[PDB]
Amino acid sequence: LKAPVVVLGAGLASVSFVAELRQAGYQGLITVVGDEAERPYDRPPLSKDFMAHGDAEKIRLDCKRAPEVEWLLGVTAQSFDPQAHTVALSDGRTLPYGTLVLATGAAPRALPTLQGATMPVHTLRTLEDARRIQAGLRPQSRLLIVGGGVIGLELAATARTAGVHVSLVARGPRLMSRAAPATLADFVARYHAAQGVDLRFERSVTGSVDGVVLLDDGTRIAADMVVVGIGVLANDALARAAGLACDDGIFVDAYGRTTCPDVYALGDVTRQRNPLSGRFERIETWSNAQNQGIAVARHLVDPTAPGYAELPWYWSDQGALRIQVAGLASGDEEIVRGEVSLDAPKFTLIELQKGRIVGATCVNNARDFAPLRRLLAVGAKPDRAALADPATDLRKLAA
Amino acid sequence: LKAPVVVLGAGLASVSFVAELRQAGYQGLITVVGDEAERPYDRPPLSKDFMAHGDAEKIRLDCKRAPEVEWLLGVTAQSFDPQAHTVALSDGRTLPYGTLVLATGAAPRALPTLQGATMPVHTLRTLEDARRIQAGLRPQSRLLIVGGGVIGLELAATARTAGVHVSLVARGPRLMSRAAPATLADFVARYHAAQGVDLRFERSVTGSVDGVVLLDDGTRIAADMVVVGIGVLANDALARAAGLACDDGIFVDAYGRTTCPDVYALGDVTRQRNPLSGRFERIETWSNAQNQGIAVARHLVDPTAPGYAELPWYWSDQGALRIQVAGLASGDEEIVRGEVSLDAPKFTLIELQKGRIVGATCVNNARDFAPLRRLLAVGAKPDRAALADPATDLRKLAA
Numbered sequence: 001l002k003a004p005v006v007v008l009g010a011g012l013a014s015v016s017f018v019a020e021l022r023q024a025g026y027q028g029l030i031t032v033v034g035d036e037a038e039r040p041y042d043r044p045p046l047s048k049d050f051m052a053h054g055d056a057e058k059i060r061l062d063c064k065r066a067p068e069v070e071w072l073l074g075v076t077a078q079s080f081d082p083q084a085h086t087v088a089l090s091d092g093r094t095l096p097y098g099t100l101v102l103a104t105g106a107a108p109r110a111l112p113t114l115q116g117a118t119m120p121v122h123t124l125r126t127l128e129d130a131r132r133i134q135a136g137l138r139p140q141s142r143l144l145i146v147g148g149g150v151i152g153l154e155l156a157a158t159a160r161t162a163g164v165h166v167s168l169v170a171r172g173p174r175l176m177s178r179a180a181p182a183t184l185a186d187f188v189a190r191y192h193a194a195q196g197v198d199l200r201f202e203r204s205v206t207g208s209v210d211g212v213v214l215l216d217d218g219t220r221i222a223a224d225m226v227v228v229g230i231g232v233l234a235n236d237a238l239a240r241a242a243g244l245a246c247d248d249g250i251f252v253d254a255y256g257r258t259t260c261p262d263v264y265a266l267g268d269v270t271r272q273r274n275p276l277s278g279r280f281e282r283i284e285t286w287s288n289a290q291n292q293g294i295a296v297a298r299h300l301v302d303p304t305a306p307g308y309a310e311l312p313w314y315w316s317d318q319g320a321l322r323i324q325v326a327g328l329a330s331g332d333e334e335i336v337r338g339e340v341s342l343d344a345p346k347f348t349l350i351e352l353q354k355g356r357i358v359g360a361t362c363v364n365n366a367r368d369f370a371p372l373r374r375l376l377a378v379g380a381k382p383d384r385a386a387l388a389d390p391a392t393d394l395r396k397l398a399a
Numbered sequence: 400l401k402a403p404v405v406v407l408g409a410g411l412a413s414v415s416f417v418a419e420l421r422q423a424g425y426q427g428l429i430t431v432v433g434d435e436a437e438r439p440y441d442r443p444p445l446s447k448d449f450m451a452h453g454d455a456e457k458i459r460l461d462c463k464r465a466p467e468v469e470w471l472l473g474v475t476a477q478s479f480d481p482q483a484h485t486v487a488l489s490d491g492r493t494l495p496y497g498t499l500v501l502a503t504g505a506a507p508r509a510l511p512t513l514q515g516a517t518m519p520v521h522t523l524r525t526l527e528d529a530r531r532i533q534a535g536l537r538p539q540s541r542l543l544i545v546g547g548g549v550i551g552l553e554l555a556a557t558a559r560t561a562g563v564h565v566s567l568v569a570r571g572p573r574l575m576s577r578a579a580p581a582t583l584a585d586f587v588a589r590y591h592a593a594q595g596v597d598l599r600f601e602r603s604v605t606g607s608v609d610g611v612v613l614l615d616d617g618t619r620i621a622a623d624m625v626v627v628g629i630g631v632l633a634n635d636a637l638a639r640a641a642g643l644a645c646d647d648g649i650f651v652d653a654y655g656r657t658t659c660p661d662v663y664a665l666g667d668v669t670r671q672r673n674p675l676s677g678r679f680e681r682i683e684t685w686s687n688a689q690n691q692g693i694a695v696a697r698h699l700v701d702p703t704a705p706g707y708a709e710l711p712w713y714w715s716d717q718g719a720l721r722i723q724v725a726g727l728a729s730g731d732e733e734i735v736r737g738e739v740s741l742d743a744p745k746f747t748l749i750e751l752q753k754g755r756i757v758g759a760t761c762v763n764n765a766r767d768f769a770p771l772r773r774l775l776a777v778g779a780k781p782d783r784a785a786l787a788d789p790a791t792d793l794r795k796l797a798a
């Protein structure tokens with residue numbers, strides 16, 4: 001940890017990192033470069049309460065635990081010179097660094113077939129996106145969502161609640177194909193269909209003509225607006241130009257180190273080891289952004305601290321469904337606690353592999369999620385009869 | 400480049416690296432730790448001329464361009480401490496380093512279903528392997544090869560030439576599924592079948608009982624020996640224990656840097672960027688081992704030198720077929736020069752993507768391979784009619 005510290009990106013990973021540096025005792029310079037001209041803010045409400053109620057001051061991140069930080073907002077880092085230890089800024093200035101931290105996140109993938117579209121086509125990543133989408137969302141408007149991931153599904157629910165007609169097109173046979181058990185994905189499709197969402201599976205957008213979208217089955221969908229939610233690409237251009245190892249994401253170890261000396265990376269921009277699968281993955285969760293940022297900062301200030309070691313997990317609020325998912329989506333067995341029903345959904349899934357818990361899902365059952373994450377952390381092998389038995393208290397079992 | 404240099408592994412990548420360091424002007428200490436008790440040697444003849452003629456002194460690597468290097472042969476590096484800058488050796492000694500280079504290659508994957516086998520089951524990676532296989536290869540013996548990659552196919556040809564009966568089982572629908580155009584793979588299967596190889600596609604080994612192997616179709620194959628050739632796994636255990644980013648291979652950039660300061664890696668043990676596909680891959684070719692080793696050494700001694708930048712290519716000698724393959728296995732078009740026939744095989748394949756050459760194959764046509772690799776290097780977009788026209792001289796076109 002050499003002063004001064006420069007962080008590129010001012011999202012959740014960056015804020016969490018700089019707050020931890022200060023909390024851990026580092027008092028040297030910290031400068032954060034953020035290309036969006038916005039007080040740092042959290043993204044999950046953009047698909048939900050913000051989309052619905054429109055108050056950005058309710059979604060700002062608290063920078064109080066990060067005192068004495070200069071935030072250069074509305075400024076883009078254009079390049080860095082890892083030999084000179086400098087960063088070049090879009091406003092003409094240069095910053096020196098002892099330690100450089102890349103926390104530039106990821107940007108939505110565009111749909112090549114809609115490139116020359118002449119109807120409103122947005123992605124949903126920023127406050128500016130959400131404001132723009134919000135302003136086109138009249139009741140009885142027709143919204144088409146492309147992609148079956150959680151963001152599109154979160155927006156789908158918010159739109160329906162407002163009285164918007166929603167169609168959703170996904171190229172695969174199921175929703176949430178990334179990091180969700182099949183049982184959950186099937187149920188989530190059932191729920192949204194019952195709420196009026198017109199689901200089209202195994203279809204792709206082939207193009208569009210004057211307010212209508214075309215599909216690979218040769219059919220059409222007309223809509224007042226398309227929101228594309230087909231995943232994101234790491235914002236790793238600076239790393240790539242400077243010679244760091246990247247592949248849709250900057251490779252880092254558990255200390256956040258890149259292959260370039262004195263340059264670290266964290267958050268959505270990184271490809272990192274998933275301790276459960278043992279494979280490198282770009283882990284794009286809110287918990288990762290915060291916890292990896294904290295872990296990397298902690299180890300920078302105190303090198304005796306361990307590397308980042310958390311197992312991955314996320315939540316997704318989709319209307320009446322409060323979904324929580326931890327670990328791997330499947331193993332050699334799934335245990336289902338409770339009934340899987342649209343009549344007051346509440347259930348828990350437990351994925352095991354050779355008797356060890358490797359994943360868990362709670363739907364409207366937050367009480368069980370915390371003890372399951374603890375059991376998951378230690379690779380617990382509880383009695384599967386007890387795990388199934390609804391009499392069993394998961395909290396107590398977690399001892 | 401801080402002295403002293405320690406290299407772990409004494410295979411082709413290591414030898415090529417240390418020879419380049421010396422050639423480039425570095426005169427400080429170099430110590431190489433090699434777990435095999437063998438004068439450093441080249442592996443390709445093990446499936447061919449060595450298997451057939453048995454003279455290991457014809458396959459030693461020339462260490463002459465690497466003067467003043469201490470080679471610790473028959474010694475295993477057990478761990479390294481990247482803070483202390485030391486390596487712990489199996490013989491009880493410790494080596495200090497300024498710069499550590501991991502060139503530990505890869506080891507054959509074992510077949511879990513043959514774990515408790517009670518018939519001879521070998522892999523083919525080392526001189527010791529080849530000697531052992533050689534000694535069980537009587538004419539009219541029955542050899543079963545598991546896996547359809549090039550090493551097994553090279554051995555298949557060598558065995559047939561000696562009068563051994565050969566069966567080969569591959570779990571997929573084709574041979575050489577890794578980095579070979581389908582047209583080549585189909586032809587290679589045709590050739591080996593015509594030479595007497597009993598090919599079984601889309602079958603897996605489920606186990607074995609008293610001299611007989613069992614398959615997932617419920618059938619049996621009896622053999623005097625099984626040689627397993629189902630791919631390799633990076634020897635990255637030391638890197639993993641020391642906290643480097645690894646995933647069946649140590650991630651490096653074009654300078655050979657790992658995520659750990661003063662530790663580099665090269666050769667079969669690395670996952671690196673393929674400039675043609677733009678993705679990270681473990682590139683397990685002879686040309687990579689030598690050329691990546693040379694590039695990393697060159698840049699260590701002279702930091703103004705460029706990073707490793709070669710496009711991947713390999714050859715495979717399979718009996719009457721002298722196969723050479725460069726670049727990607729497919730694009731949006733394949734041009735075929737010459738006829739694809741078992742009657743004196745000679746042909747060239749050219750893979751293009753948006754008019755640019757992205758890959759090439761020559762079978763018994765080495766004359767065309769060198770100009771194709773040059774065209775491939777610069778992303779040439781030659782007239783496809785000329786590329787097809789056999790009147791065309793590829794060498795001259797390469798201007």
Ligand SMILES: Cc1cc2nc3c(=O)[nH]c(=O)nc-3n(C[C@H](O)[C@H](O)[C@H](O)COP(=O)(O)OP(=O)(O)OC[C@H]3O[C@@H](n4cnc5c(N)ncnc54)[C@H](O)[C@@H]3O)c2cc1C
Nearest residue numbers: 009011012013035043044077104105267268285286289314
């Ligand atoms: C609509 C929406 C809904 C979500 N809901 C959920 C959810 O239900 N659950 C969940 O787990 N997660 C959800 N997420 C939240 C999410 O996971 C976090 O926002 C994210 O993981 C934070 O990662 P980050 O800080 O690394 O990246 P980012 O938030 O993307 O921050 C990176 C910042 O760096 C900026 N930047 C990039 N390049 C440069 C440069 N050269 N110079 C300066 N600045 C640059 C970027 O523009 C960006 O502002 C949702 C996200 C969105 C968009």
Ligand SMILES: Cc1cc2nc3c(=O)[nH]c(=O)nc-3n(C[C@H](O)[C@H](O)[C@H](O)COP(=O)(O)OP(=O)(O)OC[C@H]3O[C@@H](n4cnc5c(N)ncnc54)[C@H](O)[C@@H]3O)c2cc1C
Nearest residue numbers: 408410411412434442443476503504666667684685688713
């Ligand atoms: C049978 C066979 C046929 C082949 N034919 C072809 C071919 O037709 N074309 C082609 O392109 N390639 C072929 N290859 C050749 C090949 O590609 C090269 O051998 C390989 O790519 C060299 O890479 P390397 O130097 O990085 O690794 P290696 O050759 O594996 O060298 C690594 C060495 O490090 C040692 N080591 C590992 N861990 C430790 C430790 N902790 N301490 C000390 N030492 C350690 C290993 O045991 C090994 O000796 C063939 C290989 C084989 C085995």
